[PDB]
Amino acid sequence: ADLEDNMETLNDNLKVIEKADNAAQVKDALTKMAAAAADAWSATPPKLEDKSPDSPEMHDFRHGFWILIGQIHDALHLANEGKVKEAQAAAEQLKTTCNACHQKYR
Amino acid sequence: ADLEDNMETLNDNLKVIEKADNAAQVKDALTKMAAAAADAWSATPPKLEDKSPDSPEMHDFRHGFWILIGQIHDALHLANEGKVKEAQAAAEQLKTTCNACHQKYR
Ligand code: HEM
Numbered sequence: 001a002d003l004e005d006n007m008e009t010l011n012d013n014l015k016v017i018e019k020a021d022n023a024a025q026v027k028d029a030l031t032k033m034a035a036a037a038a039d040a041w042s043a044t045p046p047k048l049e050d051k052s053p054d055s056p057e058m059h060d061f062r063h064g065f066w067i068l069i070g071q072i073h074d075a076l077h078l079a080n081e082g083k084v085k086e087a088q089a090a091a092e093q094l095k096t097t098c099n100a101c102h103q104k105y106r
Numbered sequence: 107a108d109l110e111d112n113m114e115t116l117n118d119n120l121k122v123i124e125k126a127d128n129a130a131q132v133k134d135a136l137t138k139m140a141a142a143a144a145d146a147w148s149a150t151p152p153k154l155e156d157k158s159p160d161s162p163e164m165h166d167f168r169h170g171f172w173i174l175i176g177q178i179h180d181a182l183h184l185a186n187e188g189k190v191k192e193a194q195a196a197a198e199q200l201k202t203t204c205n206a207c208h209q210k211y212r
Pocket residue numbers: 003004007008010011014045046061062063064065068094095097098099101102105106
């Protein structure tokens with residue numbers, strides 16, 4: 001529930017998806033990711049600790065989780081359509097969204 | 107952070123949106139809604155208290171917030187395009203997602 005644990009869950013489940021052999025394994029990992037991002041939403045990263053809760057930076061930080069949550073859902077839908085490799089590929093591409101936030105706020 | 111508080115935030119800001127006369131009012135209310143939904147993600151509703159956290163019903167409960175969060179985002183994007191009335195209309199139509207969950211799980 002702290003920001004570290006949420007980030008590990010995100011990281012770990014990205015690796016679970018990469019190594020997965022069926023759609024159920026992918027779905028489970030993706031829902032775990034979504035829950036971690038949702039929980040991360042209310043956090044203040046150390047580098048934005050001096051900004052007000054409703055500053056543009058804090059809004060944008062939260063928006064970074066918003067984008068990720070949408071994209072995790074896109075990958076979930078691919079898995080439900082039986083597109084295992086495509087869902088795995090979509091999950092890998094999530095790193096772009098991971099990195100976008102890290103570059104600004106980590 | 108309770109399920110009650112989160113539902114009030116959601117309800118109250120839906121009313122703020124309806125009464126809004128500018129884009130900024132609509133944007134702010136929508137982000138507060140998204141934050142409440144994200145926070146509600148980890149909750150177990152009274153009716154699903156005897157179900158396991160990874161039961162289909164619990165996944166579907168969480169999925170209800172997932173759908174809502176995407177739809178709030180859609181309304182947010184309308185506002186950012188300057189389509190204020192359209193964003194207000196989109197926010198009002200969120201109620202069907204509100205009700206979809208209430209019907210199953212409230
Ligand atoms: C699936 C996507 C993501 C993955 C796999 C991921 C992974 C990680 C990992 C493993 C760490 C700790 C290791 C390190 O700092 O070197 C970390 C830190 C961090 N992440 Fe992420 N992350 C993701 C998405 C995001 C997003 C979307 C945001 C912002 C909205 C974010 C914000 C941060 C911040 C602020 C830290 C530093 C934490 C601290 O120092 O307390 N991350 N991330």
